[PDB]
Write a protein that binds this ligand. Structure first.
Ligand SMILES: NC(=O)c1ccc[n+]([C@@H]2O[C@H](COP(=O)([O-])OP(=O)(O)OC[C@H]3O[C@@H](n4cnc5c(N)ncnc54)[C@H](O)[C@@H]3O)[C@@H](O)[C@H]2O)c1
Ligand SMILES: NC(=O)c1ccc[n+]([C@@H]2O[C@H](COP(=O)([O-])OP(=O)(O)OC[C@H]3O[C@@H](n4cnc5c(N)ncnc54)[C@H](O)[C@@H]3O)[C@@H](O)[C@H]2O)c1
Ligand SMILES: NC(=O)c1ccc[n+]([C@@H]2O[C@H](COP(=O)([O-])OP(=O)(O)OC[C@H]3O[C@@H](n4cnc5c(N)ncnc54)[C@H](O)[C@@H]3O)[C@@H](O)[C@H]2O)c1
Lengths: 475, 476, 476, 476
């Protein structure tokens, strides 16, 4: 198992305090892993600065070929990557093999293409006697910080467009899930010039804090809590760094009377509880038309109680556990304070779902109003709340009444209603009659307190490039 | 008389708080006293923007396009009046304003009326089997928008046109020293937009400005001004995760090689180092001159600069105006004096205040500045240019890049190869070759590093004020 | 004065050949006789374009943009004179011209004024080490543009705005029947544009049109018209490898599923099958109605259509006008009578000529037609709609796609699934869902298969008229 | 032992018509006899393409992107074999094919894998109130693709990668003299794509190509070849309104100013005027030299060119191969003979046949040619370059533009002003500055005027093979 930080032209154990990397399924320690010291952080950033000189001067083709080689290397080792991810996060092995790995390999391959495919206003004489052109150039050194929920995929989303933009990068995985990052580092070191990608480990309050405050770092990219993003903006303020923030979401699900309830329920069953609902796009805030409200709750309760987790065979598991005991207790806290109300009812689950490990029972919270904590605030667990609306209510207006703005869905067979909702929802993504589906050509990213910047799509690469106007006077 | 009232939703009204003394900077004489917006007026402006957002975020590009064309028409119809007003408030030579500034302002509103109808995105299709995707660019919300004093009306064009054009609503604050043209445009705009789409409030950065950028309902803050002001805006944005658009000033390097057209270089810096009394984030101010031509350039530029006309009775004969305030003049005076204390630095011309009253400073050439001098490292924002010698053993691009600024730059040489190598490698939002300072409404202006991010002019300005949305329809 | 002169470079000039008898198609009365261009005048026209191209191709996007706005302005100031003249020439009901056509025409010129400033391409950069590449879109050359009679002033807008906008010069020929608005506009254009950028000649397709499209100096031919004419343009392009832009014919299919809003469908078809007396290549003319609603759709459409007002003295009360000519009316009649003699076919309303004078035909509904019937295979170009039944077993999208035409199409269903599958699979340049006929100057219009290729409206029309150029500078 | 079978849907078949004698152009010796497709195999290939279209047109961009990556990978795994076979068929020196062609071919396929996932269009949104528009780029149909003999495998990549990538199916015919690499590629492609997506037939232009281009189910024709062939393709297209994509050859002018690096110019022409024995449409063949450096250029070029190595027994030491055929060689020789007859022209070196066996021609410099000479007006497609003198009185760009061709061009000067002025006024799809011939897969290659239209390489190649579609949903 790879345990070495990638610092410039060499691999190197951390010299600071160890993180106790836990198996979330059993609670047992996977490994103790020392974090980067400040000296190592500086070294990594210095290497990045050194590599920038030559790496910012590569052609799109050269960088494309490098992204394709990272993709091969991952593919060639998809199995071990999948198993290591499964171990680190308690995800079901086939979900990782079948959903995550091909998505991850496709991401690197998608970026290899977008790198050769940036557009801009056409070159020409916009002032008489002067020829203008627009380039999209590297920005500088990127500090990249990843959450624990989709470690290897988060790494693809952060690194592919950063490197592909001609930038050099110092990358930090979550303290809980550094594993796939250290293995991918060993692989990248054999493909990329030294210092183009640097990988350090450690806590957000020490190592992450040092990276986001480092004077040489030009852009900070982060996915995590709203609170973490606010820290990033605060640090950014000190030296006017560019930022890229993906800050979570409570995705609204609007269900009209003419929805296919079977599709809706099966949709929420998987997409509302996938990855134990530790997903920023998780279907969790349900608005249900009054006519189908009771049927929805009923049918959803029984379909949710069949969700398999913690089974002795990782083939039959549909959802995994929560990342930590801390994460589980927080999910349990939001559920208790919901079960607090004499108008809210927990129809299924609500309790913790194991002795050893950090499992939580799939939960349906019903009767919840716009006022309630479970609706207004993010739960980040295998929990879903349901809220009634009527034909006299503007469910889009209700959905839009939020600090969040990442992802959303609308379920109805009526093209008129679905398209009206689609044009009015204040969310980075709106699915119609599905939820949760991503494709690497299409942008994922919040508005409002969910943040700004996109993962996947040409747009991410645009996020990591500087737009430059060149004007030549020739009269 | 003059336009005095704030535009607050459907209401025109006077400020409630402390009066600012708006000064004629040529004379130091008072123009008018104008009261700041109260906290209640700020909140009311924002609430009006919130209400107007409902309908305005729902208009089509053609409708918005048509509004931008109308605003442009209104300004064009009153072009001489805007120009005189702006000349008065800033001390800009009347003809520079009439010929350079108004036509660029009008054309800006017209450019953006086009841009609104011409946003591109990845094409719609089935990227996943049985699912149709499309990409939209939607409004972001309410924009808090704050302008500097150096180009008040133009900066209002740059801040409002793309913001409104993206289907947003705006609360706009001009600099405390330069509200006059903003309150005039506000009158015309109220006759064109539905109420609350544009709201204009006056006041100091530390009072009115601070309250606006910290308003919970404002989702985007756009600021042109000081690096320190952008740092304050970012700190405010940290509280509710607002989007930000920051143009924070520059220190444009001008790389002059031995094979430049020296006459061109000199007439270049004479104009673009000193235009608007150097109160321009793209001023040609940090010169790197190759050893073979350093002394001739210093000698010729000094000669050229000392002929710059200012503070003449006949305003059509003036080339540059004064600095905006006593504070600004002193700051420039203090930078120059600290530079002259340096034994290796020679002030070859100017270097002192330039008038008995009002806020003129003499056009100044600072020779012999090095890469670690304050005058090379920090923005001065006065009619001041420094020159730094490099040799053929020195990488002048590397020197130019060794800066905290990233806004604008130029390279002078007849050699196409050196010119394209430098254009290729310069870490600046903009790089001119054998000119400086020329802008065009289709082309983006905006910085990197501590100059900030976001663009003004071009379709990129409009992209900054819209939200990219992915719509995916599962059909089977 | 009613404008009658050809614009040839810097001269206005009467044609010197055979006169066309321009008719009032409401009454069949003569309006004026208009001489067509000689070969000499066509040569001078193309020569003037050649000469004007030198300078025009070197203008900036902003200069061309401003010229387009000035053209829009001129049309807007004379909107009513234009509408009155288009009504007189074409029989189009006056308020339809005033409220529908003119605003769209004016907005087309303005849309292109923006589009000229907003062309994109792949970004400049170093795609090979030490080489900077950039992409420009430059003028093509001299364009010969040929227009049909159905929408005379709008076709001129679609043909000229992007051609001129892209830096090209033009020789435009209106259809022989409808030259009047083109000649009025040529007079206004001459006061705005440099001589010879736009030239306007009159005459018949087989004399003047044939001469224009065969001219060796003409680099691109644009035609909107019959499939046979597009073929003739293609034959002519073959002699000198001219670029071509061909909009050639539409027989718009309308797929109505059993779950459509039937009231909306009926009201849609009442408006869109008959607008401009069905002289529209996007007319909703070939209807496919599912077994469940077929009968009711036929009854309700029959009834709705029988109320369409035309040929009333008060022109403000007319909903549709006459056909352009006696020939065109006689052509429509033949198609319909031949259809009626078919055993499985029923004419449920209309089917006769509709006036004692002029060239009206009764709005007609034709039920029980099949894929094999002439009325369904061939474009009729008159106020005639046909309804064909299909069952849940049939693939109506395949039926629709079983055509040589590929211009426009609509699908009517409240089911989002059915609507999206159809949208993705229809082999048509345009697909509406739950409407038909609605255009917008930002979105492209043009065919696939034998409907041709090239777009009108949108940035794509401007792209058709510019040449993509790769410029690569070796710098090491 | 080589691949000899046509690919016709799910089957490999020997052609059944007359055999082509495929020759080694270095020796004149026979390589293999290879039968043409019959009319029935042609119809079969097209019908297989029609059937495969139903499924292939409905694949996602990712699916197609992966198909292109596997084709790229397969060629890469057999790079040396492909190289050897192309070197045998064309007599191209082995390391030119290995180091220049193969990497360009393989990268072309990877480039398009990327472009497929990266198409853009006007953004989706409500251009009319209550109507969501979006733009798609969908497949056009069945492509008939015809390739020339000069770059067989590369032309195949240029034709197939974007056509397949746009979701079309294809029937491809290589040049009758160069089928060998296409048949080898056919086996690899057939292990990767669904049957009938790509079909490969062989034969003469007059028989098989003619039958292919005139097939009524072919919706688009792409030809790279001679102007005459392009006119024939247009002739065919007139009969069913087929889309066309035409690269019809070049006569690349090279403008050399008095202040160019003459060493570079000489070295540029030595390589880029004679690469592939000048059987290349971008060959640096028409030189315009300033009066001050004309005599120097001619002298030094002559020197440089008489050292060009060819027909050595060690192929790694050969820099150019032979002409493809005797008819080609005799055409080149006949062009030179006629130039030599002109009294003001001097063949300074070469000008004769260059081998006893096979089809070598001597690298040739033709000095003193004017604008009026045949050798300047007409493409020669051999190892021949002509030089014309211009003075400072003359506008050399205008001279370059006085041409029926418009494919590629270069300008040589140290002066950035002169380079950029030229680059903006040259009427050529490509202009290089201070190099020639350099291509890159992201950048388009295609001509104007009689060089045709459409692009090879770049996203524009893909746009040429897709149909732009507007979908509009009335939601209210
Ligand atoms: N995982 C997500 O994307 C996501 C989305 C929405 C909400 N959340 C919320 O966040 C909490 C934990 O999730 P998480 O750990 O993935 O998010 P987090 O923000 O706590 O951690 C994300 C990354 O940022 C780093 N980090 C943390 N504090 C930092 C600081 N001050 N400076 C620099 N870097 C710092 C972490 O080490 C980690 O690499 C949960 O309570 C959950 O509700 C997470
Ligand atoms: N208007 C359309 O878009 C359209 C589409 C399909 C069919 N049609 C049919 O065409 C008839 C009406 O004619 P139209 O004017 O609409 O189209 P048309 O093809 O007859 O003419 C269009 C334009 O092309 C010109 N033209 C005609 N013959 C030419 C030639 N040989 N060379 C060069 N130019 C030539 C005409 O003068 C006119 O300006 C109707 O019967 C209608 O059914 C029209
Ligand atoms: N190779 C080029 O790109 C090019 C460019 C300009 C000129 N030329 C000239 O063309 C001659 C060499 O032939 P080439 O293969 O390069 O060009 P070509 O036009 O003769 O052949 C190109 C392709 O077109 C096919 N073809 C030929 N006649 C056809 C017809 N009537 N219908 C349909 N398809 C047909 C051919 O079989 C071949 O596959 C030389 O004399 C050269 O001067 C070639």
């Amino acid at each position: 198992m790879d345990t070495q930080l990638l610092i410039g032209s060499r691999f190197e154990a951390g010299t600071e305090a160890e993180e106790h990397i836990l198996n979330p399924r059993t609670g047992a320690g996977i490994i103790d892993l020392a974090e980067a010291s400040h000296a190592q952080i500086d070294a990594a950033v210095d290497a990045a600065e050194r590599a920038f000189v030559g790496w910012s001067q590569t052609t799109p083709a050269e960088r494309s070929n490098a992204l394709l080689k990272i993709a091969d290397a991952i593919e060639k080792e998809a199995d071990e990557f999948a198993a290591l991810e499964a171990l680190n996060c308690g995800k079901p092995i086939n979900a990782v093999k079948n959903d995550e790995l091909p998505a991850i390999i496709d991401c690197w391959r998608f970026f290899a293409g977008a790198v050769r495919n940036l557009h801009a206003p056409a070159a020409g004489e916009y002032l008489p006697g002067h020829t203008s052109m627009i380039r999209r150039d590297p920005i500088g050194i990127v500090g990249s910080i990843a959450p624990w929920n989709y470690p290897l995929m988060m790494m693809a989303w952060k690194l592919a467009p950063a490197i592909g933009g001609g930038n050099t990068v110092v990358f930090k995985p979550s303290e809980q899930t550094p594993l796939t990052a250290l293995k991918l580092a060993r692989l990248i070191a054999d493909i990329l010039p030294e210092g183009v990608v640097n990988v350090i480990t450690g806590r957000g309050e020490t190592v992450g804090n040092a990276l986001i405050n480092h004077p040489k770092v030009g852009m900070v990219s982060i996915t995590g809590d709203i609170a973490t993003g606010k820290k990033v903006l605060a640090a950014a303020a000190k030296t006017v760094k560019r930022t890229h923030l993906e800050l979570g979401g409570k995705a609204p699900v609007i269900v009209y009377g003419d929805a296919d309830l079977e599709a809706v329920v099966n949709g929420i069953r998987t997409f509302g509880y996938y990855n134990a609902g530790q997903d920023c796009t998780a279907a969790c805030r349900i608005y249900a038309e009054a006519g189908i409200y009771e049927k929805l709750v009923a049918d959803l309760t029984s379909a949710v109680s069949t969700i398999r987790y913690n089974l002795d065979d990782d083939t039959e598991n549909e959802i995994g556990p929560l990342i930590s005991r801390r994460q589980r207790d927080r999910v349990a806290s939001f559920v208790e304070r919901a079960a607090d109300q004499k108008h809210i009812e927990i129809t299924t689950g609500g309790r913790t779902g194991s002795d050893e490990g950090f499992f939580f029972q799939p939960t349906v919270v019903a009767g919840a109003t716009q006022e309630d904590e479970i609706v207004r605030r993010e739960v980040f667990g295998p929990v879903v709340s349901v809220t009634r609306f009527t034909g006299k209510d503007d469910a889009v207006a209700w959905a839009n009444d939020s600090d969040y703005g990442l992802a959303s869905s609308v379920w109805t067979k009526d093209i008129s209603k679905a398209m009206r909702a689609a044009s009015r929802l204040q969310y980075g993504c709106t699915w119609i009659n599905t939820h949760f589906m991503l494709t690497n050509e299409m942008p994922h990213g919040g508005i409002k307190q969910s943040g700004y910047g996109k993962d996947m799509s040409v747009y991410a690469l645009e996020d990591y490039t500087a737009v430059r106007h060149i004007m030549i006077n020739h009269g």
